[PDB]
Amino acid sequence: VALDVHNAASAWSKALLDNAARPSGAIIYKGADGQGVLAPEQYERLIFEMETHHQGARNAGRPMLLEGGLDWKPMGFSPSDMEFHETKAAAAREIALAFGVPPMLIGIPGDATYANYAEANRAFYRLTVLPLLTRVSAALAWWLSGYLGAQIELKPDLDQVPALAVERDQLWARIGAAGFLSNSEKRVLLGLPPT
Amino acid sequence: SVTGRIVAMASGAGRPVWGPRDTVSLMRTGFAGNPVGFRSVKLIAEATAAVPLICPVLDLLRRPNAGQGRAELFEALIGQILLSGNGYLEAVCPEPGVPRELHVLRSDRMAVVPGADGWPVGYDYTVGGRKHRFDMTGHPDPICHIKSFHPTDDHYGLSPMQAAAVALDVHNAASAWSKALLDNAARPSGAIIYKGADGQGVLAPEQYERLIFEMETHHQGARNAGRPMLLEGGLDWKPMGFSPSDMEFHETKAAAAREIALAFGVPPMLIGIPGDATYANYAEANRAFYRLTVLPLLTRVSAALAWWLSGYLGAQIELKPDLDQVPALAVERDQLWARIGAAGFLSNSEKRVLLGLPPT
Amino acid sequence: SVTGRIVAMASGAGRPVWGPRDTVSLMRTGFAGNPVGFRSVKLIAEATAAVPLICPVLDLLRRPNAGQGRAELFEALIGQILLSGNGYLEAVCPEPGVPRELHVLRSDRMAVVPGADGWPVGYDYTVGGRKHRFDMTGHPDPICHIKSFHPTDDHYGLSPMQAAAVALDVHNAASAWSKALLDNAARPSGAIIYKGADGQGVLAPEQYERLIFEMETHHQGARNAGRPMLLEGGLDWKPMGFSPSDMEFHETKAAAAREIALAFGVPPMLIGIPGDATYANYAEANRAFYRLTVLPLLTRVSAALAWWLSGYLGAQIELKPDLDQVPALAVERDQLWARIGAAGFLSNSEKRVLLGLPPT
């Protein structure tokens, strides 16, 4: 549902910029009657004084004498910005919600949930990547072991993946500062080959 | 490979498969047309060319051909992958091993041939009505075909510009909205209405040149701003406005300018678009840029050069990005050197093997 | 290569190919026309000239010719690349090696010739109706042709001004909107409406000079601001307003003033345009400027001078930017010296070799 909102709200603004007639005004010419056209002699006079002397940046604001019958009604454009702007941006967040990516990584706008990308990249490799990768690798560990004789395990590294460095600072400085237990007693905790 | 034969017959073996027609028009309307699509590819293609590589073979990559340097090659190579999802590299071999010419063939004029077993047998460089028919029915296989991931197609890539092709046309037309609004708009700063005794009445060209000369001299311009302007009977001055003044599709352009930057994967802070502060202080956004959309792209192309060029050599060569002395990753390098450097319990050579140093 | 031979005969061998039509008009409307497009090129072209180089040959670069210095050469060279996507350098060689003249040929009046095998044989300098026909059918090849990346064209560059050509015409016309609005506008500060006994009636020129002189003396000006202004029968004062007062295309100009700065790649903080704070404190935005749009641009031109000028020498020379003692990269140099200087585990000579020092 959130794809079809985001696809059609984005295509709303495309076809609004492509099918829209806004005028910057309208020179209403009634006449002596309630209705009256102006002759093509008068009409090319009316274009050429509008083409040359009134349109464009360089003619912005000429005082524009209006004789009897003529009148200039300036039109507006009342919804100018923001055509389904928030409902697209809410749907652009629900698509990112379903796959599980944070809004900060993909680049969609929104309120600051995560702080400073040491978290949101660490949240990305912990809620929707490494649970996904440890589930496929558990199936390659069993399907490919059916071709071998001995069964093999196959898991993600969960080490030297640089989005999990904030979980690695936090665990090395905890045990490195624990001075009570000895040197070889903490190489076995951090995953080191003991000496 | 066993199922390869079944998909080949449906497409038709020995016949060129084209894929997307409108590929050449997204280039002129989305990469030569708007700055956001222009800057996003130029920001990536000049970043992947700057990253050094780790292996001989790199002597070819350093000087591929005349007039097309090492860094200029990957800008042409990645610049086709981001634009049309496909990268091509012709190798010209006067010599049998390590062919001394590389040429990025543009992917507008290249077409695949499915062949017998589904994997390609021909590539067709089609300029004008002229074809070439490169052959893949051999061992060296003279063109590496780098695909972006496409789930539905079996022969091409997806080209992120195609995924942002609606948001490009919003940004192209909202920017051209304000251009043609500044070029087609009649605003007056007022209107001197002259009705007359009747409901309608013109004023004589004697009176009309009198009306210009008191308007030309005494009322228009900066220096006559605010004259008290006597209006006799019949005359009246109705001042017009311009009711939407700023901001003609200003936020929908600024939202589409971010969705273009979203698809190519650049952060909004690097390209320069306005927007809410997502990343903080450029130590993150430059590090996020070389980790989510540059180094995954470069390690995928370099993995195809590591295998295509090793087919010309005897021994297979690995070829990966350096991920060291690339100065956008210094916050991941401070963080890893100060972690192990502060671990005083393990000895000197026990952390040179961790940080990657040759031990002494 | 092989594809190129086919490409030539499509366009036509031996005949000049011109490329962009409007590149002579984008210069006057986009570089002499608006300050944002003017400053953006001047910000980059004066940055690439300031970067030192690493190699004899640089003695040519220091003094190329009379009246055109080292820094003045690259301002002319990069100033053609940013404007029209192409850089040209004529070399005059009285001597066989290291030709003692360099000349930035402007890219308005230069045209390529595809030649036989697709790679160029002729360049045509066309001023007026007069040509020169430089020849590329030799080894020294007297013009280096520096291309910006263009995916659709085979002979020219893309020229970021072409990608910002809509945002230039918005910024040129919105700025000229406010100019001609301050020059063509009649606002009155009021209107003394005089109807009369009839619906229409003029006032006699005896009465009218009485009406000016009581308005000229007693009501206009700062010193007469607010007189109580008795209105007898028939007379009436309708004060006019001016309903859009400020802000005529103020944000659409300021959004277009950012998209011009976006396309050339300068940050908004360096050039001085207003906008939301993306970069923080100029140690980043100047470091971002010399890393995303200057040093990738400078290492691409210097890689072409390293190969074109080595065709005049016997031995090939490398020529790269210094990437050292360029004072915008000091935050990448603090960050790397304090990392290894604080790493006390590895010895003294083991870190002089990392930081780039001559070892002791």
Binding site: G36, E41, E44, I47, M50, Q55 | N184 | -
Partner: protein, 194 residues
């Protein structure tokens, strides 16, 4: 752009014998007495009021459209709407050498927007000072019977009004004069540069 008529109506093409019947036939005083050539002078005044409000021609008179510069690149909409067969697109120069052209343009007829619409993108350029000049025959048919009869009734509703009361005296019909004209007026919404 002067657009003077080459020839006017003959006068014998106008339905004066029929307008006497729309004035008083089947009901009335008798045939009565009407200055015959007066009744021709009110038909020419009612047609020329409807030729101006509708920009039609109604009798298929010959025209001469002599204008200096082409408005579009190629289009050149003709003002008098029901056209047929450009007589000539002769092109005079500033001195009067009057060199006609015979190809390069194909008149595309239409009651809405008659055009010249040259072949490709090249319409005959103008000698500097030498106005271009287009002679054409515009209108429905040669006789009065070839007209749309609703437009012919708007002449008879109007020419009888100029006969029934002379000065501008005061007097809302469902299909009046104005309601029969409005499907022949030109509906334009351009006030722009093209």
């Amino acid at each position: 752009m002067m657009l003077n008529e080459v020839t006017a109506v003959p006068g014998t093409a106008l339905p004066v014998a029929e307008f006497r019947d729309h004035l008083r036939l089947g009901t009335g005083f008798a045939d009565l007495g009407a200055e015959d050539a007066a009744l021709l002078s009110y038909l020419r005044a009612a047609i020329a009021a409807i030729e101006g409000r509708t920009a039609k021609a109604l009798i298929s008179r010959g025209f001469r459209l002599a204008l200096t510069a082409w408005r579009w690149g190629d289009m050149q909409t003709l003002p008098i709407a029901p056209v047929a067969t450009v007589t000539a697109l002769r092109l005079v120069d500033a001195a009067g050498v009057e060199t006609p052209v015979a190809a390069g343009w194909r008149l595309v007829p239409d009651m809405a927007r008659p055009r010249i619409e040259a072949l490709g993108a090249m319409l005959p350029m103008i000698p500097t000072g030498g106005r271009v000049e287009i002679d054409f025959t515009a209108g429905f048919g040669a006789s009065w019977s070839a007209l749309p009869v609703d437009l012919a009734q708007a002449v008879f509703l109007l020419a009888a009004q100029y006969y029934e009361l002379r000065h501008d005296g005061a007097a809302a019909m469902p299909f009046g004069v104005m309601a029969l004209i409005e499907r022949w007026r030109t509906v334009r919404v351009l006030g722009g540069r093209p």
